[PDB]
Symmetry: D3
Subunit: 294 residues, 6 copies
Amino acid sequence: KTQETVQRILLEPYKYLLQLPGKQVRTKLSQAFNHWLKVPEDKLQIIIEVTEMLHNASLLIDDIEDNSKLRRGFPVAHSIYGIPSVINSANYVYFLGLEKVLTLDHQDAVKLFTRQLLELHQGQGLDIYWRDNYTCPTEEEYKAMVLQKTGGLFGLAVGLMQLFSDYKEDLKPLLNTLGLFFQIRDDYANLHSSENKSFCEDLTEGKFSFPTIHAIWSRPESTQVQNILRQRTENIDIKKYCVHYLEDVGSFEYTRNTLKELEAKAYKQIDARGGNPELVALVKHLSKMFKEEN
Amino acid sequence: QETVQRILLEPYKYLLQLPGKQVRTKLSQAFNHWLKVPEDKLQIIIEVTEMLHNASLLIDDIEDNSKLRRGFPVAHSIYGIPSVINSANYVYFLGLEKVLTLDHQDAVKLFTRQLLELHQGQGLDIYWRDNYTCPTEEEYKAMVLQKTGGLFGLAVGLMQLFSDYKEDLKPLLNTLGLFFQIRDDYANLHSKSFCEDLTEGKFSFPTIHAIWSRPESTQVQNILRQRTENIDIKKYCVHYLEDVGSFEYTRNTLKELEAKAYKQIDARGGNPELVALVKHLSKMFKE
Amino acid sequence: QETVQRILLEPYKYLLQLPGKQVRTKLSQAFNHWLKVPEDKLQIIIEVTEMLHNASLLIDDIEDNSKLRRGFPVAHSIYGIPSVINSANYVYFLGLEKVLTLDHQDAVKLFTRQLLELHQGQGLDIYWRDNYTCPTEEEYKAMVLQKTGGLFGLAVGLMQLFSDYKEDLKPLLNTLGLFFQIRDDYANLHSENKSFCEDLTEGKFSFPTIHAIWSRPESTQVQNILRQRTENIDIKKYCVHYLEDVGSFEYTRNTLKELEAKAYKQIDARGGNPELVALVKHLSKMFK
Amino acid sequence: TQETVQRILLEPYKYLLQLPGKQVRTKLSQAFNHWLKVPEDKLQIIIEVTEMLHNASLLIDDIEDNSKLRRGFPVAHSIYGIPSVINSANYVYFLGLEKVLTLDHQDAVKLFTRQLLELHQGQGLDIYWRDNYTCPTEEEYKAMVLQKTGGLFGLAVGLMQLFSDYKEDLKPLLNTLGLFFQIRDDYANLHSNKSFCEDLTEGKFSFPTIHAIWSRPESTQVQNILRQRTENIDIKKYCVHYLEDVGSFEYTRNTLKELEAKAYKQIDARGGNPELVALVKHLSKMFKEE
Amino acid sequence: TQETVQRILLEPYKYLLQLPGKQVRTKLSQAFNHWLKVPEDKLQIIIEVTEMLHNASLLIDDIEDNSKLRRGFPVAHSIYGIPSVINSANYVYFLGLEKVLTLDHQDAVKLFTRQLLELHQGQGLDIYWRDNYTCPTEEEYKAMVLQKTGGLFGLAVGLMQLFSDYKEDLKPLLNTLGLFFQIRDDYANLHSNKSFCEDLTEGKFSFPTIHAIWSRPESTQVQNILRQRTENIDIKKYCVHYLEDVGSFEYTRNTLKELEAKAYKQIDARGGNPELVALVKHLSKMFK
Amino acid sequence: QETVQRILLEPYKYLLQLPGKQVRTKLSQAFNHWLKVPEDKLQIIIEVTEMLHNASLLIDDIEDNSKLRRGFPVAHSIYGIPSVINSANYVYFLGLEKVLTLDHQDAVKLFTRQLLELHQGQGLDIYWRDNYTCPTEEEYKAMVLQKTGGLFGLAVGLMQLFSDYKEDLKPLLNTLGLFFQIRDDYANLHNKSFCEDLTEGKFSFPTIHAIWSRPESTQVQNILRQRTENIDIKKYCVHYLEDVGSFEYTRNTLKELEAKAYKQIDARGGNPELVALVKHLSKMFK
Ligand SMILES: CCCCCN(C)CCC(O)(P(=O)(O)O)P(=O)(O)O
Ligand SMILES: CCCCCN(C)CCC(O)(P(=O)(O)O)P(=O)(O)O
Ligand SMILES: CCCCCN(C)CCC(O)(P(=O)(O)O)P(=O)(O)O
Ligand SMILES: CCCCCN(C)CCC(O)(P(=O)(O)O)P(=O)(O)O
Ligand SMILES: CCCCCN(C)CCC(O)(P(=O)(O)O)P(=O)(O)O
Ligand SMILES: CCCCCN(C)CCC(O)(P(=O)(O)O)P(=O)(O)O
Ligand SMILES: [Mg+2]
Ligand SMILES: [Mg+2]
Ligand SMILES: [Mg+2]
Ligand SMILES: [Mg+2]
Ligand SMILES: [Mg+2]
Ligand SMILES: [Mg+2]
Ligand SMILES: [Mg+2]
Ligand SMILES: [Mg+2]
Ligand SMILES: [Mg+2]
Ligand SMILES: [Mg+2]
Ligand SMILES: [Mg+2]
Ligand SMILES: [Mg+2]
Ligand SMILES: [Mg+2]
Ligand SMILES: [Mg+2]
Ligand SMILES: [Mg+2]
Ligand SMILES: [Mg+2]
Ligand SMILES: [Mg+2]
């Protein structure tokens, strides 16, 4: 059993990332959705653990794929332990999550786990494909990818909960709204505001995110943003210049407007389902970020 | 229009061009001499095995900074590291999806256990290499059983779920796992490109012997730490390995493993296909 | 002062050490079969043309990260990129200066028109490569007519200023421009001039790789290899094997054989030209 | 793809036009037009030619000098790439040549050719010395500055003079203004466009560093620091301290104060020019205090 | 001509003489001369030898450690280049040997040789552990520090004692002061004249990081951060936060206060020394 | 303990595997034909000489960014620059320690003088290369006399402290020093990999000739400034050197030095071993 220290070696990058929980929005979202689903506490606890394990593991992988520098205000794990250690450690946690999903003792849990992880990797693969092949998505293509990349894990937690629930109404349209809302909110924070990532890391990554997609499509006579993204640059002045352009062509105002529409849509969709005070409060809390800047 | 799936799989499809499936086919057939798996289950198991193995190679080439595999560029040198990580991980879960089609209550548990063991072996190999702590020979062997036994044990274990043959194949699987890996360490330095294991910096069976058997020198550790592509440094380090007897020691370890495999195969009633495969693979360390 | 000019010209004189085929002069001599330009004007026109040609090669090797030209190291790998840019651009305007000595009211306007054409072709070639958008075959050919036909048209157009010859040479110049560039795309990947498949390291879309990309749209292997900007010999050999396997080299050879045949028909349409015929035939040994 | 091809080829050029600096060029045109009284149609073309050639030359210069910022903006090639900007700048050179033809003057191209050859001779000497590690004497530097800056200076004024009845010799004044503008640019760069002392990162021999090198020949630290091509702020701060301590900044201020006085003398010798005097005075605040 | 040769060879050395820290060595010379009362002619030579050897060893040490700043100035090799600074420092070593001979004492050269061998054994262990990724124990670290600092400490004092009537054993005090100076450095480097946490960029095992490594053996965080040899400010800030949280800075302050108290006790055992006490007291403001 | 000593000396011990001890012993033996040094003193002097020479090569390989020496990887390419600097410098002072055991009043003073001369030559060589000022041919030779005479004069000078042979060997040591260095300059472009001198960017005898004899070209200066490993640039510059006659000029200089060596040896009563050694070394350019 002592030889099992190997477990400590393999998990150290994972435990490092856990040194500072970001939010437990997926945990708090699970609790909010249990207002409808009324899942027995023992099953719910396992589902939350699986969900957060996969979430944190995917952040380890995502930061490697994106050449990110900070997460949750801390250096990314692979910048300390190295990329090879963190790939293996994150992937190890994927299969520890599969192991935990088996303890739910439901014939369909693994099938749902599989379905959602395939969707997550399709979303992530599209995000990477567009960025690294320098082909900006349309706004609609971006949204559809976000539903897979971000809604994927939402749908895993909620889908697993429904396996143990008598509530059989379709929650997928609301999950879709929350997935888009969460990602665009994150796209906005990364370029408009440190607290999570360092200064405009999305620009250094070269990713097409909601603000830059708007700037690219709404001013087609300029290729400035595409070229800056292609430079994969860390230069603070180029990044500051590109943020000024996004501001001047209304990309940040357009992103705030989209977020305000998504928040309003969430409230309507929650009201159509009989209400949910916990979910309303969570959406409202997440929406302070794009409302009072001055 | 669902051209997405081809984009996500292209690094995987690229790797399928590479030599190496035949030996995996012969291993399936050789073990089927005992297990006599029904063709429909056997076909699914081979597909699962091929997906997981190849996906793990895509990842391993990134973890090891390799340039060539079986004479082909590594996939991430064409498609990029971010694309290949995601594509390899996608295939892991397509492999999980396929094992579900086996329609056996224990297939997923065995899949999970074996993938966990594969990652424990890989993690130790990476930890030692990148934290500059050379393992003992016993630690290396224990790690190899995890690193190689993972998919070895998955393929055979899945076959046994559908077999009346219930004898213990694990000791033989252990011998073959050590045999394959040490033979691979030996081939790498004794003639991927020229001595790529030295560029990777990994502690392999020959360098582990040289490090421990000549403790007054830090030559090998320092060369591995350089992570160098320099051919003269590599040629220098191979000559040292030769002079302190590391290649002779590895050949002898391999000859013991070959003999043990034959002993264990006979203890299981014989297996002409496996004997011929072991004998053929053992020409690599013979003059 | 004379020593200032030697300092400024040293990268240019360095490149001139290399023995070029001077095909543009031989083409000038062949086209003079029709145009019959007095030798004094012709010598000036030839000098302008080779000056601009060699200066544009200095710039092109910088824009393309090339390592060898005509079997010698590129000038900027010896003297540095800043020195070679200024020296090459210096020669552009020395070419303008010599163009003035032709003492013809229309010489400068033609010089200007053709260099605007050269930079539009070159700019498109650079734009596609560095923005990772592969051109269609038709788009590629049209830019080649500007990039490579541009300088052909400068030499012949200047000659026509001093000629009574009234036939239209533009269709033949277009064929020779396409023929020369595709022949060069082919040599770079199939065959000294450049090092091993430098076009793949540059990441440019050339006739063979354009064919492989469009004719096998379900694979993105070539686009990705070009995007890597790699010097790895094994990746390059792999990419050449693919081009061969999907018929890209056979397709390029057939395109070249059609272009050679078209040149002969167009030369016959202008009364014949033994010198130009022999030159096209000589250049066509590169394939077959 | 119809007119959008031109937009693609011209985008690095259009990007640079966002940058402050045209106002001073406008004020220079207006100041010299006080004497030259150029008809508006010819003047408008000449200003267009000058803005094209000047900006195209800055695009090339930032590549040649490995600059990162110009007038607080990213250099064009750090956004669009070096290959794109080279071709785009050179394209603009010949669009400038095309525009020069519309002046319909037999001598316009001869002047264009002469002045662009001068520009490239100055630039080549500036690059040659820097990248071959041979520091010029002050006199060699000044002669190079007359070519490097006089090139477009003399083109603007020379083209204007082709359409003017004012035929007095402006070259001595253009030479003074050329030295004045460049040395003021060397001084501002190290004394505080570019980020912190970018000239040191470029490694160029500028007026202050030339003085320090020649006036303290028993030390080679400045040559060695320039050779480092460094972005290290501490090395740059150290080298500024050395220049200060050996009096190179005081020497540069004195040279600039002499040039300002000479400009006024040469302007008075040409009958006066309140606009040019006011521009020189405003530009000369850069090397003063009180 | 030779005059200029000497200036060429000595310029990296003369550059370093601009840097602060001359005063501390002067204050140490005078404080120990309170006991040793060295004849002025010998003392001046010894001070010169001490300054030559110390500065030369700092020139070399900055190359070995990839440092950027020393005492707020750029390291010499960042201006003149590593090859120039190596040769210049080594030249000064033997100019220091040449000057030691002018002491005209049979044992001066024997003491010089012994102490420089001492210094290089300390330096070699410091470099060996760092670059072979083997963290020393606290005891091993202290023993290495006694050699690295005792090298020049013992040379200066040993040479002074050759010409002195004071024959008491100063080695125990030199050992304490050597530990005091190095650990006070280790502390200043990470807790505040180098730029921000250069020791982390160097990857060296210093007193605070040695404590963190051994006191939390289930973590490899510090070893991995040191292995990165990073200039990333956020990683450095993270590693300083970690050191604080596991008590490494508190532990270092404790060692420093024990060393300070021991120095005072050892100084009093040697008859007192107001100058040395005041210097130790001033240096001890850095903690508590 | 003693394992510290092994740690500190490992880069030095690595270099001892390399060839070239043979030539140095042959040089010691040839000069002992005149000097007839007592065996106990001779052994210490040989030991001192090998320590200082090998330590100086460790340092030189760092200063010169070399890849190979005598067909082996340079020590710092295995152990790292920091380890090799300290180990080489450690051996310098172990060499001083061993010199003390000669028990001669003038030994350390001679040791000091010669080590200062070595560093003056080395420093000038480095100064010219890294400040991009090519020496004149005469400046180069004077620098070579310091760089090589340092250890030549140390070995021979220490021997003479214990010798009745008191004739002036310095003019001969000067010629042999030039012969050795210029021959190595010649071999490098005509041990190390392909033209490592060009990668180092140093001014050596062939490139100095090419630079001064064709002053209208800066091609060689620029190639050296690139500090390049590109084989095509190296091949280009060697062919340039051939075409402007630098290799023939270097060969002629070497044969003049060989002939002068023979005359200077005969002026000292003859020395069959030294003549035979010079003759063998002259096969390289004949
Ligand atoms: C590896 C599986 C992908 C899962 C991705 N998660 C949504 C997190 C990634 C992000 O949200 P993050 O901003 O990096 O945290 P992204 O903006 O890159 O989409
Ligand atoms: C991610 C899991 C990878 C499993 C790796 N297999 C052992 C094969 C890889 C090797 O055998 P290979 O020689 O690289 O193919 P390695 O020497 O790296 O261990
Ligand atoms: C600056 C204008 C560029 C002119 C370059 N010539 C057209 C042809 C140059 C080429 O053929 P080359 O093979 O590099 O000589 P490219 O295919 O790169 O364009
Ligand atoms: C290619 C022609 C470039 C002409 C350059 N002008 C002198 C202005 C450029 C400068 O003043 P700038 O400071 O870069 O704007 P430089 O210091 O480089 O000389
Ligand atoms: C006090 C006498 C010892 C001489 C100093 N050593 C050479 C090293 C200098 C150091 O203290 P420094 O902080 O770099 O100056 P190091 O940390 O590298 O050990
Ligand atoms: C400090 C080292 C001084 C000793 C150097 N010797 C001349 C031999 C070194 C050489 O001959 P080598 O060819 O590198 O061995 P170099 O050309 O560099 O001078
Ligand atoms: Mg991300
Ligand atoms: Mg991402
Ligand atoms: Mg591997
Ligand atoms: Mg591996
Ligand atoms: Mg292997
Ligand atoms: Mg080209
Ligand atoms: Mg090109
Ligand atoms: Mg071409
Ligand atoms: Mg500039
Ligand atoms: Mg400039
Ligand atoms: Mg300037
Ligand atoms: Mg230090
Ligand atoms: Mg140190
Ligand atoms: Mg320190
Ligand atoms: Mg050398
Ligand atoms: Mg040398
Ligand atoms: Mg040499």
